[PDB]
Amino acid sequence: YNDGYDDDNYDYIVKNGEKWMDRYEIDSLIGKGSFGQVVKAYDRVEQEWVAIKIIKNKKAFLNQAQIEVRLLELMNKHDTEMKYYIVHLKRHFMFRNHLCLVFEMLSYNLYDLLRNTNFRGVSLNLTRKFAQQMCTALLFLATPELSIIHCDLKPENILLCNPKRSAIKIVDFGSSCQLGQRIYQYIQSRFYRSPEVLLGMPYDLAIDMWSLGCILVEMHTGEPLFSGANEVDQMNKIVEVLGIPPAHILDQAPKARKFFEKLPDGTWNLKKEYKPPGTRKLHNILGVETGGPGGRRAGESGHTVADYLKFKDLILRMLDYDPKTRIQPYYALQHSFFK
Template structure:
């Protein structure tokens, strides 16, 4: 990609670099199989945002286009973000990379567990978090939304603040519409449902399986099904 990428197809971003004529890169805050996420500043209003830069490999770019379509549906059906799902603020291309802009949140539930030495959450706190995730899943199951998340795990649920319990479900990169299942090898292994393991048809019930595994882990500090 004209020297802009490393050997893994990730864009080589430089602190202070401007993306989309609007966002100034500050630092890397996350790295995944398909993308990197940066803390950036919106030059229009000074707000800090999370800027996701997808790898330039064709298969990842196609998946990113599908994610943008899913996120557009979420934004259309929940413009104020009351159902605890991440909101796409902007999307654009930068030197051959699909870029997505989101609200900057705090730590993931996995990071929260790690910071507390995996002692597990107290039940009252866990109930508050579970209600919010269930609200998100109920929203995704609505006929007008009809999305299977397909990668629900502690790393993909972020707190708005390190000192609160308000949260958002993020990362719809493996998701699909219920009527348009795109992938067969999905879900992270600790949270992978029997349907996916056996390679049989699946539904949004796989998200409930993942949630059950998550809740046990968040309470005990250990994965329910380590593999």
């Protein structure tokens, strides 16, 4: 495999201490994903640490990463001071037949953060700082000349800049696309998949906002909001909480009959054991009146009934079935949850 350097999976086999192009000293493996690996390395030229994303030596992942490159460079045109919470790509090169993207060094992802809470959540206060940043970032993505849909937002793809501050950035634009290129279908990570994509419908940048809604709940409860084991399980879990989608959407939806049928009165309903539509209330998931998630924030400052109600209202606005009315970054930042 690649002269001895690659494993079965088409990944580069790392050796600590290795020096690349008399420039980068590879310190260690940070983590793996589908696209391959990220290693910690020292750049002797710029005299800083970098995270190097090493793409699998395979056409599918390579082509995907070149898309990521194009988009990242595009974003870096607009954001010259790194203000808009998108990881910075410094440069890229080929090396032992693997594309390598060189990023600024960040810290843990919000999933790993959640795992150190034992999946019991972080504070609403911290949830709010994540929210504010994330909404700002979605606002940047929606600048006309970018019009970028991340398409794979989840806690895994959101990293702290460092372990002590609440600053974050979004990573991983490998599944990303600009508005209008609608050739992809069955996109997003299932748990965070928007109704429009589930239903096979045209989609736009609002699908990220759906993802974000899911994420912010999960950041406070510690738990995925809508943990489907497949698309049917997923649409059903959404319907538990938010009820049957509006009829004017299902009428237009190619995949409507993957989850719904019509009753004799001509109205849409499910096919198939779950709680009845809209009875799994976000009011109880968040524990607005009941001390927060699992009652664990009873008495704790910043977790009042009032505060939970603001938060609930923001979320329901992000989880609007209708992509037209779903809250948009700008007005999400104007929400009373952030006053």
